[PDB]
Design a protein around this ligand. Structure first.
Ligand SMILES: O=C(CCCCCCCNc1nc2cc(C(=O)O)ccc2c2cnccc12)NO
Length: 327
């Protein structure tokens, strides 16, 4: 079938307890130590509040989990435990429960983020290189720990643009990678779904996250956010094929023995592969360089096996100015 080019066997080389999250027994502390200040957001399975730890006055966030998704709670908890101390990964401070209802919650460090819709409009060339390099550190770390994030998107990449801090958040869709395992393709936000998800190819790997990061890179350097703006999952693949080309799509499908949903017959059309330079104009030209386009071209590929790994991306010349500054 398909296997990851890096870190393919890393979970099988670790103790079973590392990846067998259904067997994980979290230590649940007392949520009563936290005073909720403000609701920050709400999703299908969780709500996040700004909070104060009343025993030490530290500001934190509390993510209250819709209880009874028990397996999924253990998964997120175990993944965060395994990622402890990872570079640019949101820090899990504690796992707590309401001591009466037993509803679980996760306590994270607080990041004073700048909303990406405002931020992306003011980023310089160097800013984009810097933040993408920092994001790559988090992905390389989690992939090396055997974990796919599966929901990389601007809302999950919190950036404090004053302190220059970046954290990859919301590990609720993340999974452990096991060679030959078939995964649910209902992951990621529509605009950040890799072609593999859109064509129902279940034997995917860490390279899914590299598609999503390529989409974010394109949106930043070209100032089109989101970059591929589908109206539904079918239209999402059409938007991708209008840039990457249809002949190239068909070669990918043939290589992996993938059959397209026949509804695509009515909507895909015929599209040449476009030059990345076609997206340059006066409003984004200062953010685009030959190195940026070369990197992007090596991320936004149909063939998940040919996309750069996070490490190879970090090694690309596009980041040399950042490396030089960090030394
Ligand atoms: O794209 C950006 C803007 C992002 C838009 C803000 C989303 C609002 C939710 N707000 C927070 N959600 C968290 C979720 C988790 C988790 O689920 O793991 C962990 C930590 C936080 C968090 C920490 N500090 C402040 C706010 C939040 N770039 O800045």
């Amino acid at each position: 079938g398909s296997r990851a080019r890096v870190y393919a066997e890393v979970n099988s080389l670790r103790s079973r307890e590392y990846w067998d999250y259904e067997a994980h027994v979290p230590s649940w502390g007392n949520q009563d130590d936290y005073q909720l200040v403000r609701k920050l957001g709400r999703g299908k399975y969780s709500e996040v509040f700004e909070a104060i730890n009343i025993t030490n006055n530290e500001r934190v966030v509390v993510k209250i989990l819709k209880p009874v998704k028990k397996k999924k709670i253990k998964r997120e908890v175990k993944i965060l435990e395994n990622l402890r101390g990872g570079t640019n990964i949101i820090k899990l401070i504690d796992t707590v429960k309401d001591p009466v209802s037993k509803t679980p919650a996760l306590v994270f460090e607080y990041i004073n983020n700048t909303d990406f819709k405002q931020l992306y409009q003011i980023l310089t060339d160097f800013d984009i290189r810097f933040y993408m390099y920092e994001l790559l550190k988090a992905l390389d770390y989690c992939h090396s720990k055997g974990i796919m994030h599966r929901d990389v998107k601007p809302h999950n990449v919190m950036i404090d643009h004053q302190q220059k801090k970046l954290r990859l958040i919301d590990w609720g869709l993340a999974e452990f990678y096991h060679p030959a395992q078939e995964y649910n393709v209902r992951v990621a936000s529509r605009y950040f779904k890799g072609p593999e998800l859109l064509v129902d190819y279940q034997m995917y790997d860490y390279s899914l996250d590299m598609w999503s990061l390529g989409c974010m890179l394109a949106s930043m350097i070209f100032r089109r956010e989101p970059f591929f703006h589908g109206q539904d999952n079918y239209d999402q693949l059409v938007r991708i094929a209008k840039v990457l080309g249809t002949e190239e799509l068909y070669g990918y499908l043939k290589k992996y023995h993938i059959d397209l949903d026949p509804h695509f017959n009515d909507i895909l059309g015929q599209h040449s592969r476009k030059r990345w330079e076609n997206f340059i104009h006066s409003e984004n030209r200062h953010l685009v360089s030959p190195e940026a386009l070369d990197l992007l071209d090596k991320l936004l590929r149909y063939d998940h096996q040919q996309r750069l790994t996070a490490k190879e991306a970090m090694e690309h010349p596009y980041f040399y100015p950042v490396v030089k500054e960090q030394s």
